[PDB]
Design a protein around this ligand. Structure first.
Ligand code: ZN
Ligand code: ZN
Length: 78
């Protein structure tokens, strides 16, 4: 077959599709879905319909930030 790109990857949710159309058709919905999410991610900027999901996301996508950083301390707000 043809070697090169494997498949497209969405940034909104993180889906993957082979055909370009799919992505577009899969994004058109995001434009309306964005409304649902009310609690944004102060870590990356994402958004969720609720905080419960925003807190866990940081443990799956930002699981390397929550933990103590390198020797060099930093300003933590809590
Ligand atoms: Zn998506
Ligand atoms: Zn995030």
């Amino acid at each position: 077959g043809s070697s090169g790109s494997s498949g497209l990857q969405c940034e909104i949710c993180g889906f993957t599709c082979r055909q370009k159309a799919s992505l577009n058709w899969h994004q058109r919905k995001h434009a309306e879905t964005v409304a649902a999410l009310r609690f944004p991610c102060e870590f990356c900027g994402k958004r969720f319909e609720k905080p419960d999901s925003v807190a866990a996301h940081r443990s799956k996508s930002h699981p390397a930030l929550l933990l103590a950083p390198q020797e060099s301390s930093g300003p933590s707000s809590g």
